[PDB]
Ligand binder design. Structure first.
Ligand SMILES: *[C@@H]1O[C@H](CO)[C@@H](O[C@@H]2O[C@H](CO)[C@@H](O)[C@H](O)[C@H]2NC(C)=O)[C@H](O)[C@H]1NC(C)=O
Ligand SMILES: [Ca+2]
Ligand SMILES: [Ca+2]
Ligand SMILES: [Ca+2]
Lengths: 60, 294, 4, 288
């Protein structure tokens, strides 16, 4: 009851994070041509996959 | 269902990282990147005249299309198919933001060129958009052809050649016109996406369209929905219709393949060329070069 | 130089 | 645990809202392109001297547009503390630029221009002609040479003028006006042959390139010595020659066996190549 809608939210927060993670990866990359040095990072969206796919094995 | 705690934990931890990264970069941005592009002596109206005047190397040059126009910088490709190519648009590493407003697309933005290893001249092109005023003026000096090139993350490449290319002035919202196609990338500009059929296809044709930026909607998608325009936040400026088969000025997704749940608005706003790789694939390399036709 |  | 995942959700969901703003701030910070150290000054005129007269004080890149030219062009101006504005049309200093170019390249120019005057280049023959003959005002040419030991010398020529393409951009001047580098344009008495000095002088010689031979030799000087120059048969002064690190070189270091370095026979043996070279012009009345 307190996890029926509560899980419906974490579902959405995974999507937002996935987008934010990607959006930031793009914005930071676009600084490579503006600033002195660039931040070498790596977006592990694989982790996100397991998360969201794993969340469904608790929705059904 | 208590393992849901590890999920929120994972995410909050993710935020700490993201916050640190953004912070570091912001700190790195306290100072800008620099270049020292000493100017080649040989100059001319555009790159075609320059290679005819002996400028055989691909690098940055100064051109003055008209005595009424302030001379400006551009990257000249003197090696691809007969040379004499004036680079109008270039993507290759995602180092430049292309999700800009009308004025930047009008004036031009990005890096024309950067220094090679140790050389005192900028022989490598950077990522940039020459500028709609400049592109318009160049294409209207006389018959102009356009060469569009792209490369995927697998290393294969294709091209789309347009024997005729014209961009009207700002008063005409930079209307684009292209004809005489030939190539391997698929005629996305004139025929729309090859995966579509009927009307869904014709509405993805770029030929004839006006230019649009997320802050200036001139697309072919008439209506009155403010959140439903072809060009949205972070999206690039392009000759959208309703909406696109190709977008060289899209967001630079690393790796190529991308999904709707990665996109800021759930749309394929990447560097796309459907006629070749489909709707959810972002090129590793994309560029646009023009030259006087003969 | 000179060329004889 | 019933209301624990109520906070870890709303708390970091809030952080996202705050982060997105920091992101928006980073975005605004990365809109500008890299800063380019080279810039072109605003002031312009018929030549560097005209520009120096208008108040320019810094040596650097400027556009000039002689009267008869129908389009302006970039040049490196050397402005000293005495209001003199020299227009440099040639510079050698490290061998970074290949000077084995054809007629058109020597006509339009090649190499690069730097605000700091630290690059090799050849302004065009057409431009050199437009500048030195734009009006009735006579010009002067100053040749600056530097050896591999830091010693420098100069050679001045009064009434300097480069003709139009119709006359093969012929080199002409009225008279050597002094300088410790010696008048190499007057040719040099290298050896036994009595027609030595005569065939190695440069005044009145047309310009030559491997593909446009206009010299006084049955052969092709320009092609042999791999350069573009006012060849006679062939030269005593050769500033557009092959750059040799260290200066010293021999006939053994040449494909054709001829002295093709950056020479000035009146200052150094023909087998000694200059480290730095500068050919600049200014209105004559400016030296007097
Ligand atoms: C034209 O494209 C549209 C999609 O915009 C297709 O029409 C409907 O698309 C929605 C999704 O937006 C589907 O849920 C509907 O089922 C589609 N209608 C059907 C059943 O056709 C349309 O199919 C396309 N037409 C073609 C083949 O050109
Ligand atoms: Ca619209
Ligand atoms: Ca003799
Ligand atoms: Ca000859």
């Amino acid at each position: 009851q307190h996890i029926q809608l509560l899980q419906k939210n974490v579902r959405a927060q995974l999507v937002d994070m996935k987008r934010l993670e990607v959006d930031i990866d793009i914005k930071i990359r676009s600084c490579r041509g503006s600033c002195s040095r660039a931040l070498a990072r790596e977006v592990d969206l694989k982790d996100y996959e397991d998360q969201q796919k794993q969340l469904e094995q608790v929705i059904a | 269902l208590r393992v849901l705690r590890s999920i929120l934990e994972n995410l909050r931890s993710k935020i700490q990282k993201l916050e640190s990264d953004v912070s570091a970069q912001m700190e790195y941005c306290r100072t800008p990147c620099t270049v020292s592009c000493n100017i080649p002596v040989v100059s001319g109206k555009e790159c075609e005249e320059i290679i005819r005047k002996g400028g055989e190397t691909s690098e940055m040059y100064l051109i003055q299309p008209d005595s009424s126009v302030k001379p400006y910088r551009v990257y000249c490709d003197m090696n691809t198919e007969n040379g004499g190519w004036t680079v109008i648009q270039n993507r290759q590493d995602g180092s430049v933001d292309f999700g800009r407003k009308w004025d930047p697309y009008k004036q031009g933005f990005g890096n024309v060129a950067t220094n090679t290893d140790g050389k005192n001249y900028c022989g490598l092109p950077g990522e940039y958009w020459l500028g709609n005023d400049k592109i318009s003026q160049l294409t209207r000096m006389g018959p102009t052809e356009l060469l569009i090139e792209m490369e995927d993350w697998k290393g294969d490449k294709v091209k789309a050649h347009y024997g005729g290319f014209t961009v009207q002035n700002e008063a005409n919202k930079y209307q684009i016109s292209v004809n005489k196609y030939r190539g391997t990338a698929g005629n996305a500009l004139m025929d729309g996406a090859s995966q579509l059929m009927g009307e869904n296809r014709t509405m993805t044709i770029h030929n004839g369209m006006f230019f649009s930026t997320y802050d200036r909607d001139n697309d072919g998608w008439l209506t009155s929905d403010p959140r439903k325009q072809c060009s949205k936040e972070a999206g690039g400026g392009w000759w959208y219709n309703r909406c696109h088969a190709a977008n060289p000025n899209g967001r630079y997704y690393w790796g190529g393949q991308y999904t709707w749940d990665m996109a800021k608005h759930g749309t394929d706003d990447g560097v796309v060329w459907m006629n070749w790789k489909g709707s959810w694939y972002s090129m590793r390399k994309m560029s646009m070069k023009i030259r006087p036709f003969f | 130089g000179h060329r004889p | 645990s019933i209301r624990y995942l109520q906070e870890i959700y709303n708390s970091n969901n809030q952080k996202i809202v705050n982060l997105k703003e920091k992101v928006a701030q980073l975005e605004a910070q990365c809109q500008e392109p890299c800063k380019d150290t080279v810039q072109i000054h605003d002031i312009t005129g018929k030549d560097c001297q005209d520009i120096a007269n208008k108040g320019a004080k810094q040596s650097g890149l400027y556009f000039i547009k002689p009267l008869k030219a129908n389009q302006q062009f970039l040049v490196y101006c050397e402005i000293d503390g005495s209001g003199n504005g020299w227009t440099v049309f040639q510079k050698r200093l490290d061998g970074s630029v290949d000077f084995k170019k054809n007629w058109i390249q020597y006509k339009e120019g090649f190499g690069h221009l730097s605000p700091t005057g630290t690059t090799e280049f050849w302004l065009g023959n057409e431009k050199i002609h437009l500048i030195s003959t734009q009006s009735a005002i006579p010009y002067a040419l100053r040749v600056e040479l530097e050896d591999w030991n830091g010693r420098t010398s100069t050679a001045d020529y009064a009434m300097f003028k480069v003709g139009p393409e119709a006359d093969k951009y012929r080199l002409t001047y009225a008279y050597f006006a002094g300088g410790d580098a010696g008048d190499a344009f007057d040719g040099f008495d290298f050896g036994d042959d009595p027609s030595d000095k005569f065939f190695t002088s440069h005044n009145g010689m047309q310009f030559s390139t491997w593909d446009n031979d206009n010299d006084k030799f049955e052969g092709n000087c320009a092609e042999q010595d791999g350069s573009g120059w006012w060849m006679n048969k062939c030269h005593a002064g050769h500033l557009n020659g092959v750059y040799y690190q260290g200066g010293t070189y021999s006939k053994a270091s040449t494909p054709n066996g001829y002295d093709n370095g950056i020479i000035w026979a009146t200052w150094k043996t023909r087998w000694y190549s200059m480290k730095k070279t500068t050919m600049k012009i200014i209105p004559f009345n400016r030296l007097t």
